[PDB]
Structure 1
Amino acid sequence: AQYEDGKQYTTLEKPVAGAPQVLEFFSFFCPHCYQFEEVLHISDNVKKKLPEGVKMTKYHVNFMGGDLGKDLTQAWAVAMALGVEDKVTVPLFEGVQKTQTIRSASDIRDVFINAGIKGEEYDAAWNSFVVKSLVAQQEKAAADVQLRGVPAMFVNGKYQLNPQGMDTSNMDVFVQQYADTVKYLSEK
């Protein structure tokens, strides 16, 4: 058929109960993740095609970059808690991978300050248990899909996007196929 198990997507041997409808994993340290977000705009192309009432969730992962990796997962938690994902995503990617001016937790924080988040506001979120639990969910979700690598995307805790089973020649066609596959999986 057009969409086939083992081609555009695979099926989790062990489905995750209560998982987000569309779940993306990434790291600000991840070069393929930079491509996905900053050049391909995979997240945004996926959301533009999701059925009505399908929320898209994006989590950060710890296993890249050691101590700063964890700082970045915690900062992403802050971004989620404050709802400023669309203000900090581009400068966090560029700060980690393009300019490499992000070397410490303080440097991460600078990104938020610059984006207009008040220091008091960032610090209170950073030290909050609401943010600790958000870090815990992100780590749990990764465990639940037995996550091996990033970028990755899962639909209804049942299906894992398989970009390797899609075309790479045109970026745009690749991105469309990816977005089109997520929508198919969401309605499945």
Structure 2
Amino acid sequence: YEDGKQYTTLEKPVAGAPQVLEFFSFFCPHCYQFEEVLHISDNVKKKLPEGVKMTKYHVNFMGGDLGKDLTQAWAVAMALGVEDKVTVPLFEGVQKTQTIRSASDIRDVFINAGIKGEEYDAAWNSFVVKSLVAQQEKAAADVQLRGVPAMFVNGKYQLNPQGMDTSNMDVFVQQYADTVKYLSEK
């Protein structure tokens, strides 16, 4: 694992940043395969060292105001701690079936998952959610993020995908998780 090949280093690291921060967008195609198809996130967590947890933030430069809403809906997910319950249906409802067309549609997804409407609305307007929306926006700009998907380790190292083996699809996935596993151990 060398700098400039499998990963890179930021000329300005981010203090207080999560151990493993991922950036995605329910609108991005790459992001769809990054998880729904390839399942890169899960593979990473399978090789993640003890005590090390991952964090995923939704970006808002895609999909217009609806994206600005998905980012807030993503904050509700983290607030109530139901990330693993809404991720899949949101990815499908937006890109696959194409049912999710507004905040009203998103609300229905959370309800169908198990969250109550009043519980959703209360959270939707809570300060914890507000802190998260700004926290996510703050984090994105902090790493001078240009596009998604993208993963960062210890707020200093950025994952470099195309700088890794991409012949066999089943290998690229493992190599990525390993680089993360290696950078987390630093």
Structure 1 counterpart SS, 2:165: coil
Give distance in 2, aligned partners of 1:32 and 1:150.
8
Gaps of 5+ in 2: none
Q: Distance in 1 between matches of 2:73 and 2:111?
A: 12
CA–CA separation in structure 2 for the residues paired with 1:160 and 1:65? 25
Aligned equivalents of 2:167, 2:62: Cα separation in 1: 28
SS of the residue corresponding to residue 84 of structure 2 reads: helix
Q: Could you give the per-residue CA deviations for residues 28-57 of structure 1, whole angstroms, max 9, x where no partner exists?
A: 001000000101111111011111001111
Identity value in percent? 100
Structure 1 distance, partners of 2:118, 2:183, is 42
Instruction: For structure 1, list consecutive stretches of 5 or more residues without a partner in the other structure.
Output: none
Q: Which among 4, 7, 17 is matched to residue 5 of structure 2?
A: 7
C-alpha distance in structure 1 between counterparts of 2:69 and 2:120, whole Å? 13
Paired position in structure 2 for 1:68: 66
Q: Deviations over 1:106-144 (max 9, x none)?
A: 011111111111111111111111101100000010011
TM-score scaled by length of structure 1:
0.97
SS at match of 1:25: strand
Partners of 2:60 and 2:113 lie apart in 1 by 24
Quote the residue 1:116 is aligned against: 114
How far is the alpha carbon of 1:170 from its aligned partner? 1.6
* Matched residue, 2:22: 24
CA deviations 1:79-129 (Å, max 9, x no partner) are 000011111000000000001111100011111111111111111111111
Structure 1 runs (4+) deviating above 2 angstroms are none
User: Within 1, Cα distance between the matches of 2:82 and 2:173?
Assistant: 25
Q: Pick one of 147, 152, 155 that aligns with 1:154.
A: 152
In 2, Cα distance between equivalents of 1:90 and 1:26:
13
What is the TM-score of this pair, normalised by structure 2? 0.99
Cα distance in 1 for residues equivalent to 2:97 and 2:107: 16
Return the alpha-carbon distance in structure 2 between the equivalents of residues 110 and 187 of structure 1.
40
Displacement of 1:168 in angstroms is: 1.7
SS in 1 for 2:8: strand
d(CA) in 2 for partners of 1:135, 1:76: 9
